[PDB]
Amino acid sequence: GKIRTKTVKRASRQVVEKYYSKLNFDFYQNKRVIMDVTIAESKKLKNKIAGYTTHIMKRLARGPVRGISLKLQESDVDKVIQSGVSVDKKTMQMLQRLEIGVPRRVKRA
Amino acid sequence: GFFDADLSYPTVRTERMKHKRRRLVQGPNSYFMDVSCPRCRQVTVVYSHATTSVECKGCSKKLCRPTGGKALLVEGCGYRRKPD
Amino acid sequence: IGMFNEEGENVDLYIPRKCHATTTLIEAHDHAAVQISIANVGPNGVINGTTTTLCIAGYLRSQGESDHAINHITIDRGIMRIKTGKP
Amino acid sequence: EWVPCTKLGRLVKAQKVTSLEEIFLFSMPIKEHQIVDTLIAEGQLHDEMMKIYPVQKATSAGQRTRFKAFNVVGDCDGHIGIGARVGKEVSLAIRASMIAAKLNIVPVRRGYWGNKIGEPHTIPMKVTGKCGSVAVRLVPAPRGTGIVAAPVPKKILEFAGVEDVYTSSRGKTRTHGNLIMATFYALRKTYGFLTPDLWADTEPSRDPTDEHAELLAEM
Amino acid sequence: TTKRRNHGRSKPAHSRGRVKPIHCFNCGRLTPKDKAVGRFVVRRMLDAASARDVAEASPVYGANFPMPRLYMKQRFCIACAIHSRTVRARPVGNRKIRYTKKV
Amino acid sequence: TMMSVLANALRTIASAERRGKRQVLIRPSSKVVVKFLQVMQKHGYIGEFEIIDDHRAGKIVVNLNGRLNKCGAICPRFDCATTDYEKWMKNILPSRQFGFVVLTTSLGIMDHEEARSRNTGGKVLGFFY
Amino acid sequence: TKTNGQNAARKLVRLRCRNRWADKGWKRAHTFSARKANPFGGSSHAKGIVLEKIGVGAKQPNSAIRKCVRV
Amino acid sequence: MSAVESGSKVLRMKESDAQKLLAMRCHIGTRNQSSAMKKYIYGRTAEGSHIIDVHMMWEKLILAARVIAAVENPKDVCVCSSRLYGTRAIYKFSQHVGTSFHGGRFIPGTFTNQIQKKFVQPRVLVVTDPRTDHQAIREASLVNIPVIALCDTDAPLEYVDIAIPCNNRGIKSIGMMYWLLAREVLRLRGTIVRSVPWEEKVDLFFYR
Amino acid sequence: GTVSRPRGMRPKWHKKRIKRLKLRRRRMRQRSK
RNA sequence: UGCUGUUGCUGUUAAAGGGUUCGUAGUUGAACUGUGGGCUGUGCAGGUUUGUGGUCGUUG
RNA sequence: AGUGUGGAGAUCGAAGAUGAUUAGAAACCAUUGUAGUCCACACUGCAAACGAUGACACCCAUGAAUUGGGGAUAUCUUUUCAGCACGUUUUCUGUUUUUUACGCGAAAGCUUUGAGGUUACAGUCUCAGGGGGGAGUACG
Ligand SMILES: [Mg+2]
Ligand SMILES: [Mg+2]
Ligand SMILES: [Mg+2]
Ligand SMILES: [Mg+2]
Ligand SMILES: [Mg+2]
Ligand SMILES: [Mg+2]
Ligand SMILES: [Mg+2]
Ligand SMILES: [Mg+2]
Ligand SMILES: [Mg+2]
Ligand SMILES: [Mg+2]
Ligand SMILES: [Mg+2]
Ligand SMILES: [Mg+2]
Ligand SMILES: [Mg+2]
Ligand SMILES: [Mg+2]
Ligand SMILES: [Mg+2]
Ligand SMILES: [Mg+2]
Ligand SMILES: [Mg+2]
Ligand SMILES: [Mg+2]
Ligand SMILES: [Mg+2]
């Protein structure tokens, strides 16, 4: 199985948030970028982070992604009054019992 | 709404739904009607919940037929509810 | 208010609040009893500096009857109007 | 060092709330045990470990043994607190129970038997407290009676500050975990009982969090 | 330690005294009709593969006239209902949920 | 079959006070029930109550301020001498500072403090506090 | 539950009298069957002649020879 | 709470609030009924939709506004909405009134777990729906927080202190009710003038 | 296993044993009578 | 030892509601015959009478 | 279930038999099979005769229902047990219930159908229990 552990996923999300502009859909350029903006004794992890980072970049192009902020790229009532409300029989009956009386711009449908 | 009920003075809405023995003061559900026979127009006082073979003196025509509850007046009969 | 000595000391530690709906003493451990302050409004729509505050016991807020209790209290206080005026 | 975590804690450290009665008045939960330490005068708060017993949970390899500790905290002047907490070691349980007991401190009302001369010495009225099957009934007693109770409730009532009381415990009173809590629950009921001396209307007052809301905001 | 409020049957405490027993569909064990697990079964006379061949060879049956099906009211004792997987043991919270229509 | 009208009435009031109701309907009514209610009303544990006539055993609607913790009847009506007041206060009242025992004396229905001041015994009807 | 009537004293007396025999200590204290079965006959001590020394083994899980005599 | 000490009539419905309530269908009640909310229901029409009494709805809204307006530090009142349709409404409401807001899932322990960062202690809690905001209401019961709610006809009113009867479903209704509440809170404060209509439009309150 | 411990043999069969024993004593006394 | 319980026990599952009715003794048993009246002094609550910031027609 | 006397005996079936299966199997399984099962009359009166919850009476929160009888006022059938019957909405009395409020409980759980309204212990009557066995035995 090739499930990415939470350590890989969390680092990938942090890389995407901080360096979104420097990333594209190519693994190899993304891997080169990540090796400069990441300190990690394991090259296997950095390769996995680059793989999941370019996966997130693909997903971001296809709409939003949960866990990624990117906070660089992150009256109709008057119209209805003019056209009338057309309240129900019982609703109209309630209005007739009010102190203000039946409001204008309403009908019995 | 906003009108909390008073037990001494119930609302006509709630009190009207009470069973006759569950009202604040119990009372009858029945009444009397003066019924005009469909043959002679003689006025006869008929109980609303009559159960015993009401006959109009004269024609001897059955004015009402007993039912489980209120009596059923004969067809084409003139009745008016009497006061009290 | 509270217990009093023969000489006249107040003796009691404190005087607990009483629920404005059921007059029950509001204990120090219920944690569901609330205080609601309603702003007083002058002749103009703006609010004054004073407020009207009512205390509701926790158990009433558990039974779901706190809304009904507040309605009754607010009506008695002359803050809320039972029925709409005549048309 | 204490860095307050709640609005009540900040108000107490800033000395805006100076008495435990203010917290009890508005039923504010106490979530930091340093609040009770600062509000109660030094040398006036006493604690005792009433009961420590082990509890075991069966496992695939033997069983896991932990310790439940009961601690009583009181000033002997109308404030009583009971805490129970389970720890892996006895020392952990005892320290946690002391913290728990402070967090659960409640006021207990004291009354008179007959003549109301001097400071109150007994409970105001007959109250019962029930936990599990153990129920503890506290009955007012005249002066000089002492605490006529079992040693466990007697210790609790001494910490609460009562002097004279008749007690009767029903149920399996040897279950001291329930016996301690039943006595504590009986003491809480003293201030919840509406006596004729408390019928009069009281003017409402603002809670300290509302009163000093602006000071709390500038934090 | 009452396992079920209804004691595993549809007989409240003041409705009836006795329900006439029925034989289990499989084993024949006599169980009260209310307690026995009752499933109404509408089973096809033939499976789809074989019904295709028979409908092919039948002037009567085809795309317009459907073939007959078997209708059986099957009542099982508790043991036979469990063993045949008609019902299974359930978590305590899930024991309460009930069904009124065949889903 | 209802055996004690007073016990039924006091049970109904105590239930309403426990639930925090504002009013409670009592049925049937009696002279003893009304006398008991007037004693509680005298000491301020209940508000105004209204007796409704229905040409039978009437009904009573009692307004309840939340001051009544518990009221109850004592059955049978045990005889109580003037020396037995302290025994009954000990047995049924929460404290010596508040609460009342209601007696049926030859001088009428009254609380135990009033009966003690009049130097009269009687039969215990109930209690409230 | 129990009777509570004002003139129900006879019922309560009979009920308590009938149910006291359910108490083993009370029944033993008011019946002679235990007294007749008691070798001392209700006495605190008794004098006897030693017949034989015997060794009564202790019940499990104890293990010993309890030195006893027949009297 | 239209009634005031002066006996004035400034805090009353003005035939314009009624038009806004009617236009956004703020008086339709899920066809279901609750005993707690039976008092607020005027009647049931054909197709079985319960009609909310507009007088009672306005009176409770004014009462809720007067409760909110009494909070000196507006950050001490939190508006919550687990439902999606209320997220923009409580966002716009907060930016106009000054309250704290929280949409989406309510984290269990937000009001009771002190040692966590993001632990908050609001003095007043207002929720869009008691049924879907049951966690926020349940936690508020442990920490002495009174609750204001936009309750529908079938609404659990257990710990709700101020119930506002409205249509807490639908984009238009939720936006309109918060718009009315924000306008009334500003009017009670005095930040705006009651004589002039409010310039902010309800469209900003509408979800998406 | 719808029941708790019988605690010393099924009580039904113990009752049966006691019943047979009662009948045996009855017949013995009848022989002597 | 509230494990004999009148005060004061328990009875779904721990010991314990009789299979169901009826039923004598026995126990218990629904309301009602009923506010005393004025007079005076003294301290309290609200049916209306002159006068004296609100709603309301236009002083009301 | 059992007993007595008559009847009945289709089905199933204690005892019994036989065939299997077993170390053994006097059982489970198969084929049988007597008493019984069914009816009448007369005995018996011991059940997990259970809601393991005595009877009568009062208060008691919520939502869907359900059976029977009545009040009031959308749909279907309508040449005779028919001025019908059902059905809609609301109400009501009485019944068997269900889902989810206090309160109670050792808990499981109960909850207007209490196991609630009880140490803040009293509506009325009645039956039963007082560690386990011996023992529901011995004797009468
Ligand atoms: Mg029946
Ligand atoms: Mg049966
Ligand atoms: Mg079943
Ligand atoms: Mg099993
Ligand atoms: Mg089992
Ligand atoms: Mg058992
Ligand atoms: Mg016992
Ligand atoms: Mg048993
Ligand atoms: Mg029974
Ligand atoms: Mg008599
Ligand atoms: Mg009488
Ligand atoms: Mg037979
Ligand atoms: Mg036979
Ligand atoms: Mg023969
Ligand atoms: Mg055969
Ligand atoms: Mg038996
Ligand atoms: Mg039984
Ligand atoms: Mg029926
Ligand atoms: Mg129920």
Element spanning B79, H or E: strand B78-81
Asked whether at least 3 C-beta pairs link D and E within 8 Å, the reply is: no
What ligand is nearest to the CA atom of residue E5? 3
Q: In terms of DSSP bridges, do strands D134-140 and D127-131 run parallel, antiparallel, or are they unpaired?
A: antiparallel
Which chains have at least 3 CB atom pairs separated by less than 8 Å from chain H? A, B, C, D
* Cβ atoms of F65 and F128 closer than 8 Å: no
Chains B and D physically touch (3 or more Cβ atom pairs below 8 Å): no
H residues 44..83 contacting C (CB < 8 A): 55, 59, 63, 66-67, 69-70
Residues F128 and F106 in one domain: yes
F5, F36: one domain: yes
The CA R_g of chain A, rounded to the nearest whole Å, is 29
Q: What is the DSSP string of chain H?
A: ----TT---TTS--SSHHHHHHHTTTTB-TT---TTTGGGEEEE-GGGPEEEPHHHHHHHHHHHHHHHHT-SSGGGEEEEE-SGGGHHHHHHHHHHH--EEEESPPPTTTTT-TTSTT----SEEEES-TTTTHHHHHHHTTTT--EEEEE-SS---SS-SEEEES--SSHHHHHHHHHHHHHHHHHHHTSS-SSSPP-S-GGGGS--
Within this chain, do residues F76 and F61 fall inside the same structural domain, yes or no? no
Q: C31 at the D interface (CB within 8 A)?
A: yes
What's the rounded Cα separation, in Å, for the pair A103 and H55?
Answer: 13
Report the relative pairing of strands H124-127 and H147-151 from DSSP bridges. Answer: parallel
* Pair (F62, F116) in one structural domain: no
A105 touches chain H (CB under 8 A): yes
Instruction: Determine phi and psi for A91, rounding to 5 degrees.
Output: -60, -40
Contact G4 F77 (CB under 8 A): no
Gyration radius (Cα) of chain E, Å: 19
Same domain, F74 and F116: yes
By three-state DSSP, how is residue D53 classified?
strand
Q: Is E45 left (phi over 0), alpha (psi -120 to 50) or beta?
A: alpha
Note the CA–C1' distance, F105 to J43, in angstroms.
31
D24, D27, D30, D36: CA torsion to nearest 10:
0
Of D28, D31, D213, Cβ closest to residue H73: D213
Kind of pairing between the strands at H77-81 and H124-127: parallel
C18 DSSP 8-state letter:
B
> Could you list the residue range(s) of the whole structural domain that residue F43 is in?
1-68
Residues of G with Cβ-Cβ distance to F75 under 8 angstroms: 4
**Is E33 within any annotated ligand binding site?**
no
CATH code: domain of residue F9:
3.30.1370.30
Per-residue tokens: I30? 């009848």
The integer distance in angstroms from the CA atom of F26 to the C1' atom of J28 is: 23
- What is the SS3 assignment for F12? helix
Residues 6 or more apart in contact with residue C32 via CB below 8 angstroms: C58, C59, C61, C62, H141, H142, H144, H159
**Rounded distance from Cα E17 to ligand 1 centre (Å):** 10
- Residue D113 C-alpha, separation from nearest chain F C-alpha, in angstroms: 7
Nucleotide whose C1' lies closest to the alpha carbon of residue F92: K120
Distances (CA, A) of D107 to A36, C56, D84, D151, D187: 64, 20, 19, 22, 8
Residues of chain H contacting C66 with CB distance shorter than 8 Å = 157, 159-161
Whether C39 has its CB under 8 Å from any CB of chain D: the answer is: no
- Give the residue among C70, C82, C76 at the shortest CA–CA distance from H2: C82
Judgement on whether residues F80 and F59 belong to the same structural domain of the protein: no
Contacts of A88 in chain H (CB under 8 A): 45-46, 49, 51
Experimental method: cryo-EM
Q: How far apart are CA G55 and CA E3, in angstroms?
A: 55
Identity (one letter) of the amino acid at B60? S
Contact F123, F78 (CB under 8 A): yes
Residues from chain B contacting residue H39 (CB–CB below 8 Å) = 1-2
Looking at the structure, tell me whether residues F47 and F73 fall in a common domain.
Answer: no
Tokens of H4: 């005031």
Is B1-84 assigned to CATH 2.60.40.2140? Answer: no
Q: How far is the CA of E31 from the centre of ligand 3 (A)?
A: 10
Resolution in A: 2.7
Question: Which residues, at least 6 apart from H164, have a Cβ–Cβ distance to it below 8 Å?
Answer: H57, H60, H61, H64, H148, H149, H150, H151, H177
Best B2, B3, B6 member to test C by mutation, with max C CBs in 10 Å, is: B2
Please tell me whether residues F64 and F7 are part of one structural domain: yes
| Torsion angles phi and psi, residue E11, rounded to 5 | -150, 85
Measure the CA–CA gap between H132 and D218, rounded to whole angstroms. 33
Q: What angle do CA H38, F16, F72 make, to 5 degrees?
A: 170
> Per residue in C31-70, is it b (16+ CB within 10 Å) or e — as a string?
bbbbbbbbbbbeeebbbeeebbbbbbbbbbbeebbbbbbb
CB-based contact C80:H2 (threshold 8 Å)? yes
Among F32, F49, F68, identify where a domain stops.
F68
d(CA I31, CA I33): 6
Let me know: does A50 contact A31? Beta carbons within 8 Å.
yes
Tell me the CA distances in angstroms from H65 to G65, H149, H184, one per residue in order.
Answer: 91, 12, 6
| C-alpha pair distances (Å), G31 with each of G16, G19, H108, H110 | 17, 15, 69, 72
Whole-angstrom distance, CA of residue D176 vs CA of residue D185: 14
Which of D198, D199, D207 should one mutate to test binding to chain C, selecting the residue with the greatest count of C CBs within 10 A? D198
Residues F49 and F85 both lie in one domain: no
Those residues whose beta carbons lie under 7 A from strand J are C 43; D 168, 170; E 1-2; F 1-5, 28-32, 56-58, 76, 91; G 1-8, 10-12, 15-16, 19-20, 22-23, 26; H 6-9
**Do F61 and F74 sit in the same domain of this protein?**
no
Residue B64 annotated as binding?
no
Distance CA(G43)–CA(D91), nearest Å, equals 56
Phi first, then psi: give them for residue D122, nearest 5 degrees.
Answer: -130, 180
- Asked if D140 and D186 touch (Cβ cutoff 8 Å), the reply is no
Nearest CA in chain F to G7: F76
**Co-location of F94 and F129 in the same domain:** yes
CATH at F91: 3.30.1490.10
Report chain F's C-alpha Rg in angstroms: 14
Distance from C-alpha of D32 to C-alpha of D27, rounded to nearest angstrom: 15
User: What sign results for the dihedral spanned by CA atoms D148, D153, D155, D161?
Assistant: negative
Tell me, yes or no, whether F54 and F77 share the same domain: no
Closest CA to F72 of F18, F21, F122: F18
Is B37 flagged in the annotation as binding?
yes
